[PDB]
């Protein structure tokens, strides 16, 4: 509502002394503060879920799936704690946009892979390969 999305052609912002080297860059707003603001709520959910996992270690094993949850949360927190310095360190660079895009996509793929694998793959393996104990 506040501001509809629009594209920006940075015809400048990379002006060099050689007129041949001049290049415009096609982008769409999406400044760094926007990325941080859009990811903040999910990161807060992450942190509180990890807090509850820390607070719930130790179970009569009737409540299974707590132990895999702990590993998933620790792994994901490590991923994003590593992500932050890369975003704040390549801010002034000649190829900032490529690195930031690749970093964000790789981080999200890694998080999804960790959750999917470590919470579902044993079950699939048992279901197909060992139907006797399903």
């Amino acid at each position: 509502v506040v501001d509809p999305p629009h594209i920006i052609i940075d015809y400048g912002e990379q002006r060099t002394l050689d007129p041949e080297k001049a290049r415009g860059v096609l982008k769409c707003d999406i400044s760094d503060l926007s990325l941080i603001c859009s990811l903040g709520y999910s990161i807060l959910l992450m942190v509180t879920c990890t807090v509850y996992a820390i607070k719930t270690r130790g179970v009569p094993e009737t409540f299974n799936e707590a132990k895999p949850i702990g590993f998933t949360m620790y792994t994901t927190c490590i991923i994003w704690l590593a992500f932050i310095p890369i975003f704040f360190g390549t801010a002034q660079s000649a190829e900032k946009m490529y690195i930031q895009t690749t970093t964000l996509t790789v981080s999200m793929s890694l998080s999804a892979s960790v959750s999917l694998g470590m919470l579902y793959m044993p079950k699939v393996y048992i279901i197909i390969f060992h139907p006797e104990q399903n």
Binding site: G12, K27, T101, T105, V106, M108, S109
Partner: protein
């Protein structure tokens, strides 16, 4: 004076002016002074005009994009396999003990992560940022 050279006249003698080539980001339309091309475009080779600065983006065939796209395809295939496996064996005790509904929500989240990798790679044409 040749094209791209600027004329300056010695006082007292209308003849034998001086020529001057101006600078990189200037073009000479007056034949006595050279103007400046705006930020959008760039001085022409002849030094009396302007040419548009090329625009660059992120392209699908670059090394910056081949790796995330590969990972996204592999992950999407794996998640689809898992979802279908759960769908076929919906009544089995393991799936019933997995917490079915929230498991489906989590699977949707994983699928969305791979899809957003695709979106971020794709292109800047307004609706994509939406």
């Amino acid at each position: 004076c040749k094209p791209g050279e600027r004329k300056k006249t010695v006082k007292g003698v209308p003849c034998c002016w001086h020529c001057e080539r101006c600078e990189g980001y200037n073009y000479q339309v007056d034949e006595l002074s050279c103007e400046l091309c705006p930020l959008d475009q760039r001085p022409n080779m002849n030094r009396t005009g302007c040419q548009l600065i090329p625009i660059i983006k992120l392209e699908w065939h670059s090394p910056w994009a081949v790796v995330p796209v590969f990972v996204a395809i592999l992950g999407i295939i794996a998640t689809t396999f898992v979802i279908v496996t759960f769908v076929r064996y919906n009544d089995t005790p393991i799936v019933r003990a997995s917490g079915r509904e929230l498991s489906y929500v989590l699977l949707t989240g994983i699928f969305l992560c791979y899809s957003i990798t695709f979106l971020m790679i794709a292109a800047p044409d307004t609706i994509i940022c939406s």
